[PDB]
Design a protein around this ligand. Sequence first.
Ligand SMILES: [Ca+2]
Length: 249
Amino acid sequence: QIHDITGKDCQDIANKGAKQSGLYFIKPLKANQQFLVYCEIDGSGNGWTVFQKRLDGSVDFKKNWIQYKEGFGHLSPTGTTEFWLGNEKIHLISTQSAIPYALRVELEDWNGRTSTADYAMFKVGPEADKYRLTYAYFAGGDAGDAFDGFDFGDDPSDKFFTSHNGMQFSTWDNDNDKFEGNCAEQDGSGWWMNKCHAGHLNGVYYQGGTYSKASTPNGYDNGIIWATWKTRWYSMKKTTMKIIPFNRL
Ligand SMILES: [Ca+2]
């Protein structure tokens, strides 16, 4: 169920001997209390700390500010459950000791195809700054750089409106996006919204992947999308968001 070795993150845990993916307790520099996390440990001593997992539609991601801050969903020793670790926890881990962390987004098709996109020096700011997302540069991966924005063809400024670097976090009850409307409320989720998104992993779980403007009453493209890999009308089967010290790349 829960393992004995502890550390500041899952890589520290892997450095002390652990070799099994599962549940562990970690306690980041500024964390006043230790908390449970799911570590993904491979055969090379890499220990990834997982903060988001989607895989079957068992959890509703339309949650409020406090819920996204504190975390929701279920942690499993087998890693077969959906959850959002919580913004406060993501902030403590990603910023401890100025350690440079890499973010890996892992996506899976309804056809079995898996792809990734890595971001170097990933950080999530404090609540005072609405848990802002920042990264140095896109490090590569076959899923493409959706965080850089995308020209959907709706408006000439599409790319400027869909990039995510520097965006604050938004929920339906705490709008901090760059839109006249409320992106989080119209989509029904919590995310680093601009106006509104090119990459959005906290969307509605559409069975089968393919969906359309007809699926929803207003025709919003509110699924689990990553524009640089699949069409905005294609919703992912599984997603994983995880972090590890940059030197482990
Ligand atoms: Ca707004």
